[PDB]
Design an enzyme around this catalytic site. Structure first.
Site, mmCIF file in Angstrom:
data_model
loop_
_atom_site.group_PDB
_atom_site.id
_atom_site.type_symbol
_atom_site.label_atom_id
_atom_site.label_comp_id
_atom_site.label_asym_id
_atom_site.label_seq_id
_atom_site.Cartn_x
_atom_site.Cartn_y
_atom_site.Cartn_z
ATOM 1 N N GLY A 95 -3.426 0.086 4.501
ATOM 2 C CA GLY A 95 -3.943 1.353 4.975
ATOM 3 C C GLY A 95 -4.906 1.993 3.995
ATOM 4 N N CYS A 96 -5.085 3.304 4.164
ATOM 5 C CA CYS A 96 -5.888 4.079 3.225
ATOM 6 C C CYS A 96 -5.331 3.911 1.818
ATOM 7 C CB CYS A 96 -5.898 5.554 3.624
ATOM 8 S SG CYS A 96 -6.406 6.685 2.308
ATOM 9 N N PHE A 97 -6.214 3.632 0.859
ATOM 10 C CA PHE A 97 -5.786 3.115 -0.436
ATOM 11 C C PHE A 97 -5.463 4.190 -1.468
ATOM 12 C CE2 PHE A 97 -9.929 4.342 -1.346
ATOM 13 C CZ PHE A 97 -10.896 3.548 -0.759
#
Lengths: 71, 202, 71, 71, 71, 202
Positions: free
Chosen positions: B9-11
């Site tokens: 996902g968003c890191f």
């Protein structure tokens, strides 16, 4: 020659191992929750001879003078 | 010192979590999995938002990093949203073996099929500088103090202390272990108490 | 009756969760890194170990596979 | 409220107890080699989660930074 | 085959010696407070516990009555 | 804080051993068991050379002191030499009970009858000043240093630190635990390092 007797608990075994490796000290790790022989060898050391002090809730392992002073 | 490359996902979250792990030496966020050169945040293409972890193998295993990987998200749903897909980019056949084995084990233990894809790492591209150590970079006080100490943005974000600080700012790290890592850094005492003064203000 | 105190940054929490589900053991999870009530409850229990497996009255600290199997 | 978990080993249990009593701190002593319940309660604390570092021969219990530095 | 590391200033050394003789157990005594060879031998064994009961290969640290009975 | 009174031969050894025990607050050597007032070393009469131990009961038991007592000598022989006889002077019926029980247990466990006599304490008379803390008093350097620190012979010999020092000089105490007791005393740092300098000279 260094040996680190570790557990399957992530706060402190990794603390000791990161300290040792960052100082480039090579060690061998024996996990006493997966290596019964390692735990039997650690028990041959006076490990149950170390006292533990319970202050109402917190636990001090060994005679850590300053820690016990602060509580 | 070894390298792992994950995508979950968003890191920002992965950065702040993996950078709190003892044994993780450094972290970078970026893009990996697509067929385009130098992707940007608004021009990813088929790339996935990924984290590259450099870890001391004497402290933490690739398999333990995988444990943490599948402990931070539950990819039991199949999406075609490549920006946020769950992927393990393997750098050698040992990583591929461990990841496939652990994925099989999770699938069997929970009865849910896992949609994380184990793929070979081609090119990991760095993300923009404002995505690196995102939480720490947005606490401008402590951020610029540590950046002046480490003498540059690049030297800062590439450090272990910066990963631990970004994790602590995100609430993923005990203050005691932040003190322990600061002891590891061996600051010249004055900068040490300056940093501690700023961190305990929060 | 099982309760499992876990954390996000811990491989052994994940491994013992997988062990319990692989052995079809219904358990309650208290992730102390996001459930502040759970973490303070564990905090003034004396422990600071993560993961903790409370089996109704007994306490297993870490992923002691053979000890957890004994129940 | 203070508890001291002791053993039948005379170097250190007496050290902790003399320190506590000399500072007029009242405590209750549980001998984990004669009180099985006391040792079961100490094991419910994360006592096997504490690492032990063996340096060629000597034993450091817990992450005693300065001690490990000196060896 | 039994060996017992003891000291003069230790009640538990005396108690386990009395236990062994009360149970008619032939044992060798190595008083580490007067036998310097014995004390240094125990010293670089990792232990610092006193009394130590070496049963040929196993090691009992302190007067663990139930554990010593198991042999 | 409780009192025990033992006799197990010449009392220099008992002094140096019991004064090394954690939980023992102070020790005195003297004479007890006779029917004469104020006996002297060359005029004991029917008295026995004895040690009076003042011990913190929160740290060590009367029974543990008895364990140490029968661990320092083996009175399986009957003598009529009253100066060196093995005696336990009890101050109350609890001490009498514990001593009689432990004597029975030793007799049964070893098959040898024990000739230690359990008698009620009448009068314990102090021994001459040159018998008190005998080993420490004969290391004139450290002795007079500690005596100047404690401000007098009486204040010195009545202290816990003096018992521990007399024991360490006699080789009955680890130097580490001597440091621990010195920490307990809380010396004003300068006297602390002076004393440590003198003790490590040996």
């Amino acid at each position: 020659e260094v040996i680190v007797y570790t557990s399957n608990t992530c706060p402190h075994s990794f603390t000791v191992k990161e300290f040792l490796s960052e100082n480039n000290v090579e060690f061998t790790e024996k996990n006493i929750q997966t290596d019964a022989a390692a735990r039997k060898e650690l028990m041959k050391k006076g490990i149950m001879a170390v006292p533990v002090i319970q202050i109402d809730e917190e636990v001090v392992v060994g005679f850590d003078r300053d820690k016990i002073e602060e509580l | 010192l070894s390298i792992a490359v994950f995508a979950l996902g968003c890191f920002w979250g992965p950065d702040a979590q993996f950078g709190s792990i003892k044994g993780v030496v450094s972290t970078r966020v970026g893009y990996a999995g697509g067929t385009t050169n130098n992707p940007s945040y608004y021009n990813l293409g088929d790339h996935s938002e990924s984290i590259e972890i450099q870890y001391d193998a004497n402290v933490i295993t690739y398999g333990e990093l995988l444990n943490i990987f599948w402990n931070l998200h539950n990819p039991v749903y199949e999406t075609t949203n490549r920006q946020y897909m769950s992927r393990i980019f393997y750098l050698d056949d040992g990583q591929k073996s461990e990841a496939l084995e652990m994925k099989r084990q999770i699938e069997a233990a929970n009865g849910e099929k896992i949609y994380t894809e184990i793929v070979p790492l081609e090119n990991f591209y760095l993300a923009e500088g404002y995505h690196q150590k995102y939480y720490l970079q947005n606490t401008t006080k402590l951020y610029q103090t540590l950046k002046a100490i480490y003498g540059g943005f690049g030297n800062l974000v590439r450090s272990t202390l910066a990963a631990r600080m970004n994790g602590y700012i995100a609430g993923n790290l005990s203050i005691a272990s932040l003190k322990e890592e600061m002891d590891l850094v061996e600051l010249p005492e004055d900068q040490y108490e300056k940093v501690l003064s700023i961190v305990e203000e929060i």
